[PDB]
Design a protein around this nucleic acid. Structure first.
Lengths: 93, 151
RNA sequence: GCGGUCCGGCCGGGAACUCAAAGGAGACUGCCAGUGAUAAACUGGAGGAAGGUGGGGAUGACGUCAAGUCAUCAUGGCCCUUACGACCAGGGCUACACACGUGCUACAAUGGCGCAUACAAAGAGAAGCGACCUCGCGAGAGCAAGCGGACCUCAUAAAGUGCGUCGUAGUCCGGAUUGGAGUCUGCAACUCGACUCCAUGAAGUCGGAAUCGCUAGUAAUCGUGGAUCAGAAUGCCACGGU
């Protein structure tokens, strides 16, 4: 099963899979992954299929993934280019 | 040696044990004139793990020396310039002062952070003269036969 | 040693017992053998908690060197000043497609994280350090009071331990600058400043010639700090380190 959007976790666990992404890191992996009963020392291929769909919606609601990182994340620099602020005036020259 | 006298100093052999294969024992690469703690990880090379080794706990020091013997090398004095080495037969004083430096180097090759993992590939399966402790046995004889004819 | 505990000696109380206060200790080749113009002096070895100016520090000849920093006030001189003297907004001690001279951001095979044990070296103690509980997911911004002191803090403090992923990659090994939101120290962010999030990631795989650091607590690098406290150490009168 594809847990991430960019790739698929193979021969790995559930904690090290959601680490290289930009949306979830070391502080975000201990807020939604430990909400339900799931073991971290067991490989993904040795888990129950009933708890796979429950954990997929946790990283999709109010959580920016790899596909939505260009869709909504960022994309503010381009919308705030008209308003001049002190910050842009000191990092240009 | 216009006026310099040649004395090899020796204050004490290792405390816990010690052999006669140390021509000069003196503090260097460390604070000198103080011997509070110079012998902590020096004795870490007789056996890394008793369980993963079928050799002796004392004979391992002699097997790492008979395989590393320089047949014909150069001399350190080099009084004349350019490339002129006066043939000087290796003196027994050279096989007990700087000969212990090549023993640790032969067991130190793989890039790690723990010196103990290197011993599992150089002593537990390479102490039967496998060919990782002969880097200084045939290299000295191969370098010679070239500069013998100089004076 | 010897009695309760909170098991940090929190106090009943004894000394030669990990330290101490006006004062005395103390280890200096001291003795022997060998050697040496018998002296001076050197390399070992009996005692002993400390053997070779014990070690460290204060300590420092104008016998060389007219050449060293006068951005301490001409400092007994000689000197200058209304435009070389002053309160100061604004023209301003201004690194722009940023080159090691006072400030480490970097150096990108030395990359990052929840997990049941006695020891405490420093520092501080009348205009000053702050108990404990409650409370702080990034940086900021806060809750809260014994005590004018042998009871707090500065000080949330880089390495180790150690199934992976990645493969000798133009990048998951990294985070200069091109471009965009705020708070605080605040006449004051216009010009020319610091704590924390970001995407495109640009030069690079250990290095030309010349030149050059390395021996009586020698050493490498992503790390602290009591001090001035407008922008809360990397540069050390320090302290503590694997």
């Amino acid at each position: 099963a594809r847990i991430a959007g960019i790739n698929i976790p193979d021969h790995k666990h559930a904690v090290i899979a959601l680490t290289s992404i930009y949306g979830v890191g070391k502080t975000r992996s201990k807020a939604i992954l430990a909400a339900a009963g799931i073991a971290e020392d067991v490989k993904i291929k040795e888990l129950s299929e009933g708890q796979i769909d429950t954990l997929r919606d946790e990283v999709a609601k109010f959580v920016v993934e790899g596909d939505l990182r260009r869709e909504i994340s960022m994309s503010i620099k381009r919308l705030m280019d008209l308003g001049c602020y002190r910050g842009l005036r000191h990092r240009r020259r | 040696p216009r006026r310099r006298v040649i004395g090899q100093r020796k204050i004490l052999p290792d405390p816990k044990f010690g052999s006669e294969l140390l021509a000069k024992f003196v503090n260097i690469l460390m604070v000198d004139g103080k011997k509070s703690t110079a012998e902590s990880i020096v004795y870490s090379a007789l056996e890394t793990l008793a369980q993963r080794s079928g050799k002796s706990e004392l004979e391992a020091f002699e097997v790492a020396l008979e395989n590393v013997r320089p047949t014909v090398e150069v001399k350190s004095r080099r009084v004349g310039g350019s490339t002129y080495q006066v043939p000087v037969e290796v003196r027994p004083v050279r096989r007990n002062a700087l000969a212990m430096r090549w023993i640790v180097e032969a067991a130190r090759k793989r890039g790690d952070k723990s010196m103990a993992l290197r011993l599992a590939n150089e002593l537990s399966d390479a102490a039967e003269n496998k060919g990782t402790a002969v880097k200084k046995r045939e290299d000295v004889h191969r370098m010679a036969e070239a500069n013998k004819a100089f004076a």
